[PDB]
Amino acid sequence: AQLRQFYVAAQGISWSYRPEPTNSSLNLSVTSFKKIVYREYEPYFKKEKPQSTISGLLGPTLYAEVGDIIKVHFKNKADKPLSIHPQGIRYSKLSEGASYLDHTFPAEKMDDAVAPGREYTYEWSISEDSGPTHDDPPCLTHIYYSHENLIEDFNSGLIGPLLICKKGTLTEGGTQKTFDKQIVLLFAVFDESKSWSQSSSLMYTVNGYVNGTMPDITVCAHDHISWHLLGMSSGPELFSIHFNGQVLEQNHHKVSAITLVSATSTTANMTVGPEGKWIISSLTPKHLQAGMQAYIDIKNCPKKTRNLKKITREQRRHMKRWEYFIAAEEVIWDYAPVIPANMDKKYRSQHLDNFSNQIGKHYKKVMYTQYEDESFTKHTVNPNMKEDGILGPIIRAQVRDTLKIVFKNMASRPYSIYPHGVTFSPYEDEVNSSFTSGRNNTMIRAVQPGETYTYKWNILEFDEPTENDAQCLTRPYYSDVDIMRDIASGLIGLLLICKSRSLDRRGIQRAADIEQQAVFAVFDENKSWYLEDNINKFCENPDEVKRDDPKFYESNIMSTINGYVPESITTLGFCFDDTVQWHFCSVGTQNEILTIHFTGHSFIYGKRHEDTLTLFPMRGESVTVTMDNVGTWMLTSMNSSPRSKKLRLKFRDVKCIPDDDED
Amino acid sequence: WVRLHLLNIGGSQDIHVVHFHGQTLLENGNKQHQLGVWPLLPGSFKTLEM
Amino acid sequence: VAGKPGDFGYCDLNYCEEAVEEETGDGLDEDSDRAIEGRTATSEYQTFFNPRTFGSGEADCGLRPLFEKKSLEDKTERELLESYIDGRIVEGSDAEIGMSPWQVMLFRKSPQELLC
Amino acid sequence: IVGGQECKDGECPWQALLINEENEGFCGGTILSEFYILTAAHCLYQAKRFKVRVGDRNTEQEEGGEAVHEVEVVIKHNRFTKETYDFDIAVLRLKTPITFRMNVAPACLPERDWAESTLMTQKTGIVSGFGRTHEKGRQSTRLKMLEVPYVDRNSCKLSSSFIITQNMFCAGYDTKQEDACQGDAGGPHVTRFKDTYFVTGIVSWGEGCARKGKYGIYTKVTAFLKWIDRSMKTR
């Protein structure tokens, strides 16, 4: 209800994108300068209100509860006749701020282009409609943008956070009374080509800083963060940031990795963990080319009065030490199981040094070989993993459960697991076991060839699975010694974050089929960690890397399905009256969302039924299928792009042939 | 009140955050949230109320 | 109180109220999954009284001389829990003789009836 | 029969009252032929001596059509295990010939393919018997019937702390107090199709009677139609 007299002025800034000039001083950076970004000013534009160092290019955060009227005086100090246009506010044409063929009056057009050096009071009366609703977090996220040039203004700047919160929770400063802190997150692909000055700026920008040069962030422990994740960019850009060590809530859904695209504004929650700096980055391949390195320091502040609510159980019900001995071991492998290359690796080599047809591909991967003997010599885990490739063994990890991981490295390189989307839980706390964490408290020993050490993994009562989720949520894991080349190698695995009750580590609810994994991951063997020995020593070509190629950059790259190429996978088959509980994982560098489809048969999505499910990179998808149509049917893809086109599994359906019952 | 039935059909990640000039959407579901715009996710069918 | 040495009387005072179901296991630690019907048990009993002060009949309770001394799963009415196929429709339709060996039924010198 | 209402005279003819040594129904009975009665194989653990008083309409008093029939022998499934929750079915060959009359007409097997394609694919199903009139209410004095709807497989799986096998299917209401109860031990539960009721199964177990979030754990009749026939011809 309060009358918000806001004073903001656009102004070109010779932005450095560096956190500070450093001891070298000066500003010799990318030629992205004179960036017109509006900044908040004192009442009557006495002077520009100071901006956060983290909010380098980020503009004035404009929180607003319902009922307010915002007297946004915009002195267009930038020398261009400009405008500012909101997105989701039912405004009036006098403060429309958007010029088009609305056939309106000049008084309702002056907003659409305000003269430079001229104050325009962009007034908008907020309403209860323009505010968070029921089942809605206490704040909502929006954007006001320069409608003068929706193409060039963004790259030239003119960006500012827009937030709308409920009454009561909103403070005078804009924080939530229920939230210890509020955090705003932004990414951009700032290009000087479509800017005021012209340059070929492929340089990527997290907030105001380039390719992972953020000044680090310090957050006290047990701090209720009301996050504000904003992803905007000119073209279609995916921002697949994983909160390493944190799980966030979006629309009553809990996920550790926050995958977003351009023009995405989001808010979430987290109560800050115990201790240790952390880094978050986008899983997009181009965001891997760039930094997007937002270092955040989770710190156990004594000046925080760590609540220690201890509203928990802390007891061995639902618990067991669950010693998963998944010691890493170098293996030979074939992407195509042309022969029935199933039943793990008993007859290992069996090869001919030929990348095609029979064994001889010699894709010398390094499996997470499961064991139960302490010495890890005998495999001791040889399950009925028929028609299964290099796949991490499933851990039916119930809520708040505990489990032990011990690695012995039977491979030429040091290795150590990264639980992605599982690290959100309190990890094995380390004070002497910091290892090569990168100062991010990632207890990553990178176990040397033949070395052995232990993981003490245990999750607390908070879980990714939720009533607005599935019984078990799919979260994978992989290595850390070299993400790109080792994912290109055979270093990947997966478990389940289970809210399940009747499982006992045996089966989530052993009444529906539990076939789960669909991993159309793309592996380039000319990108693998064992590129050298695999490609060179054990192929039908000389010992060159052969990146340059007719198609060997394309031959050695392949969108295999769970370690098996699509062309050499046998058809599925099940009998009727069955429900198949799936836990998918779209992890491959698809660069294009894929839409699977079941002929006749349909999916489930909470209550919704899909029958055609789109997929997103590096995300686990756990649903069931009501297989209700007899005969063979297609696990086909509707995108059907020639890149990953031959993806259709002829899963059969018959009326359960076995008559059983003895006679 | 008018119901939305905007759809997207596979293709190649053709996403579109449909801006509305002074309009606010409404989620139609078990939660019934309110939206400003929506990214047109390929392979997905979206229904809302306006 | 007065009268019999050891007779007990309760001072007039108020008392609080508590709830039990809201707690899960705690230091209990018995199982990881859930199961409600179909369980068998055999063990001993720990007493709270001095054996010299109670004599015979102290550490033998909670059982039956016929049904539980032999430690055998017994007939229909107790089968409701133990039968895995049965949890709601057992309905033995009768309560035969001796199903409550530890229940008392009083008479008075008044016409035959139970007061309390 | 939690809630529900009485079977009208003749509405539930195959329904039988398995009278035990005290001649009070310890189980729900199902007339199968002139010499056969159907009950769940759990009923075999509850018997000293027992007969079949077909045509009974009131446990209070004899009110017409009550003919006492004696079970010749029980066809218990050899794979019948309580832990499996499965094969809880006991065909009761009778010494006394069943006299097809008022309130005496059995339920016979349809086509197995048609039964699978039609019976378990129906919407609701009708359960009858001298059952507990409520979740714990007193046993139905009259022969009371009730109708319950089908439940999806996943709903039954989440609604049960135990296995929901390839055969067993939930049927009832999420929170409404109406279902089979104590008194429907092997109590015939049927499903209408053109006035020809088809026994789609009988509750075996479950948490309470029509409890909140709970359902009757019925047995897929279509699953063992071949075994039902082979036990019809057995003993």
Ligand SMILES: *[C@@H]1O[C@H](CO)[C@@H](O)[C@H](O)[C@H]1NC(C)=O
């Ligand atoms: C804060 O996290 C808690 C965890 O249970 C959750 O209840 C709440 O919804 C979160 N807040 C927001 C705004 O998501």
Ligand SMILES: *[C@@H]1O[C@H](CO)[C@@H](O)[C@H](O)[C@H]1NC(C)=O
């Ligand atoms: C810096 O940004 C450029 C933009 O293309 C990228 O290629 C490069 O890898 C980035 N460097 C780091 C260290 O993130």
